[PDB]
Amino acid sequence: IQRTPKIQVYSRHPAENGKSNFLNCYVSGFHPSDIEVDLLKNGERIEKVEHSDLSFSKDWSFYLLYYTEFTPTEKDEYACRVNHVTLSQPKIVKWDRDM
Amino acid sequence: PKPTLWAEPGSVITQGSPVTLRCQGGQETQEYRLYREKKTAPWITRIPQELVKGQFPIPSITWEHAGRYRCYYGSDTAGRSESSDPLELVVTGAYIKPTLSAQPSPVVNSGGNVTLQCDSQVAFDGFILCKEGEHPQCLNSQPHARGSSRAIFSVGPVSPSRRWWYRCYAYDSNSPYEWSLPSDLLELLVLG
Amino acid sequence: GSHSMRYFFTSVSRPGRGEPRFIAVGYVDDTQFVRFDSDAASQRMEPRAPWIEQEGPEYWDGETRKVKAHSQTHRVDLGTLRGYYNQSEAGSHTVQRMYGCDVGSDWRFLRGYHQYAYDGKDYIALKEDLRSWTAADMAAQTTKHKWEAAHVAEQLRAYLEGTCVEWLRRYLENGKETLQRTDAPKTHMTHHAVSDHEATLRCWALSFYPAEITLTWQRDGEDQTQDTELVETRPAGDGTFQKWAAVVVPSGQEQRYTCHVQHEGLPKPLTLRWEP
Amino acid sequence: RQASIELPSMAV
């Protein structure tokens, strides 16, 4: 049995175009664990992204937080780019201030 | 009045491919307003007003584009046209393909029935069987058992005179407009 | 209130790429404190919380010795099960385990558990009394028979009802400022138009702890359970959680709906309207 | 702190 990941892109504080924040890409309920997650600022990858340590829910599916510091802007377009054996090709979910 | 909502080539498109949503008010008005139910389609407002002809093109469709749409003209303080009948736009190829098979076999005597089995390796609870060879006639269904991720269909009675070619897709019921890659084609062989 | 300590181990095989990847991590409720990664350049059981930075090399040598042990057991299981289910030499597989104890309200021990999983599915679990096992499938019964005979159910009840709780209460104190404190949810609403006739009302709850929460949408009182979108409760990344609920409403009817917010760090349940 | 899980008795 395999499970396709859920993705949420968001922030650790309410967005505001002046302030800086934490950009979050939480991926959960996936099996197997082998997953590649990137955070993109306008198309291109962001060298030096953190995350938290693989762990799992009552049903043994996995979840991970890939976060980094960032400044929301009028122009800039942020996104998460995920890829997992269950997907035919990487998936790009853009950040949306309000989900 | 009222308008009509349709897609070209069709309303069920593989990802990475082109499509256009078409609207018309019988009465060639350019007050065409397109929207997606439940969540906003940012792509719509990146279309040039010249086109908003009742023409909405998609260079190459992705999951972003998937959903239920409606078309309408007027304003409320100006027009007031009833809104279009819903167009469910479906993107395929989001995930890896399921596997299709005929049980107990793909060869069937004339006028008989056969059981089709759709097996996804990815836990999913939506399965669609479409008969290829005209636009497909697709049928919906759920798994047989509880933790199955396997759907069963029943076709027939079959005839040597026509082609009986199928494919299936799997999907999450939480986003019913996002289907997987289709299984390879399955051909029934009707012993004439 | 009531507390838990929990350990989560995951080991995965890499064919041709030599040694398998291993990870492990411990929690005291919804806060991570320890972490091991077999790939991690450190090759040690690193700290994750501030209140654990507090332990002499005596700890960082035991919990690091011990995880390499666990890693080594899992190194073998991966091969056993490959045979128990006769799978090819090729292909990746996963085994996972989770254990901990629940200290009840009064800070004495309430429940223990130890569960095992192969390739995502249940494999074996230590039942309630911590002196019997439950096998998910036929293959698993061999492991049970092995284990009840080699005395694992009994040597485990000693770690759980004993030194596990003990060290938990110990972790509580060393970190009361957090694990015993709270953050109630900062709640707000947003409006988003879908058309000239419909909008979405999204009910937010942010920066809270513990994760457990409930968001309900009503319509004049009548629960709108059915036409409500909910997002998985997600992590803010400072030890707090977020979440939202959302209903599509007819334009003009916004004042008809209310969002209820039940939580532990809230003396009264809440009620929010778009236009008061 | 962690626990047992050292081998060989812990093997499945």
CATH number of the CATH domain containing A93: 2.60.40.10
Give C163-218 as a DSSP string: IIHHHHHHHHHHTHHHHT--B--EEEEEEEESSSSEEEEEEEEEEEBSS--EEEEE
Q: Which of C192, C195, C229 sits opposite B35 (nearest CB)?
A: C195
**How was this entry determined?**
X-ray
| Residues in chain B within 8 Å Cβ distance of A1 | 121, 123, 147, 149
d(C-alpha D12, C-alpha D8), whole Å: 9
- Give the three-class secondary structure for A68: strand
- Give the three-class secondary structure for A18: coil
Contacts of C169 by beta carbon, 8 Å cutoff, 6+ apart? C103, C107
H-only helix segments in B5-60:
none
**What ranges do the domains of chain B cover?**
1-92, 93-192
Q: Of the candidates B41, C201, B33, C190, which has an alpha carbon nearest to the alpha carbon of residue A15?
A: C190
**CATH code given to domain C1-181:** 3.30.500.10
Structure tokens at C160: 């759980």
Q: Which of B94, B149, B172 sits opposite A88 (nearest CB)?
A: B94
Q: How far is CA B16 from the centre of its chain?
A: 15
d(C-alpha C53, C-alpha C173), whole Å: 14
Question: b/e for B100-128, b at 16 or more Cβ within 10 A?
Answer: bebeeeeebeeeeebebbbbbbbbbbbbb
Q: Of the candidates B131, B64, B124, which has an alpha carbon nearest to the alpha carbon of residue B91?
A: B64
Q: Which helix (H) or strand (E) holds C143?
A: helix C138-149
Check if CATH label 3.40.50.300 holds for domain B1-92: no
Residue B122 in contact with partner chain A when CB distance is under 8 A: yes
| Most D-contacting residue of C73, C80, C119, C167 (CB-CB within 10 A), to test interface | C73
Q: Which helix (H) or strand (E) holds C138?
A: helix C138-149
Residue C86 in contact with partner chain B when CB distance is under 8 A: no
Structure tokens at A96: 């949306």
How far CA A25 is from CA of A10, A55, A96, C139, in Å, comes to 7, 15, 12, 38
Structure tokens at C182: 């709270």
Give the gap in angstroms from C-alpha C193 to the nearest C-alpha of chain D.
52
Specify the amino acid at residue C11: S
Residue numbers of the domain that contains A44: 1-99
* Beta carbons of D2 and C143 less than 8 Å apart: no
Asked if residues C167 and C5 have their Cβ atoms less than 8 Å apart, the reply is: yes
d(C-alpha C65, C-alpha B42), whole Å: 54
Q: Do domains C1-181 and C182-270 have the same CATH topology?
A: no
* Beta carbons of D3 and C67 less than 8 Å apart: no
User: Strand pairing of C94-103 and C46-47?
Assistant: unpaired
Q: Give the right CATH number for C182-270 from 3.40.30.10, 2.60.40.10, 1.10.1040.50, 2.40.128.110.
A: 2.60.40.10
**What ranges do the domains of chain C cover?**
1-181, 182-270
Q: Give the right CATH number for B93-192 from 3.40.50.2300, 3.30.420.130, 2.60.40.10, 3.30.450.40.
A: 2.60.40.10
Structural domain count of chain A = 1
